[PDB]
C-alpha cells in the first residue's frame, strides 16, 4: 500500500480514498 | 479504498502507507 497526502489532486485523479482537513487545508488521500 | 490520516497508530498497526507531517503532527496513512 502506498498512499500519500495530497492538498488537492494527484497524478491519477480518481482515487480519493480519504480526506483530512488539517491547518484549514484539505488533505485528500490517494493511494495506489 | 478507505484511508485515514492518523497522528500515531491505527487498528492494524503496520499498514502505514504514507506520511505527512502537518501542524506538528505526523499524519501516517493507513488504509483498507
The CA distance from A10 to B17, in Å, is 16
Hunting for cell 485515514 — which residue is that? B4
Q: Give the separation between CA B18 and CA B14, rounded to whole angstroms.
A: 11
Whole-number Å distance between alpha carbons of A24 and A12: 24
Distances (CA, A) of A16 to B23, B24: 22, 24
Q: Report how many Cβ contacts below 8 Å link chain A to chain B.
A: 60
The answer to whether the CB atoms of B17 and A31 lie below 8 A apart is yes
Helical H segments across A1-32, by residue range? none
Q: DSSP character for A15?
A: -
Using what technique was this structure determined? NMR
Amino acid at each position: 500500500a502506498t498512499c500519500y497526502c495530497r492538498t488537492g489532486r494527484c497524478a491519477t485523479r480518481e482515487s480519493l480514498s480519504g480526506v483530512c482537513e488539517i491547518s484549514g487545508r484539505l488533505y485528500r488521500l490517494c493511494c495506489r
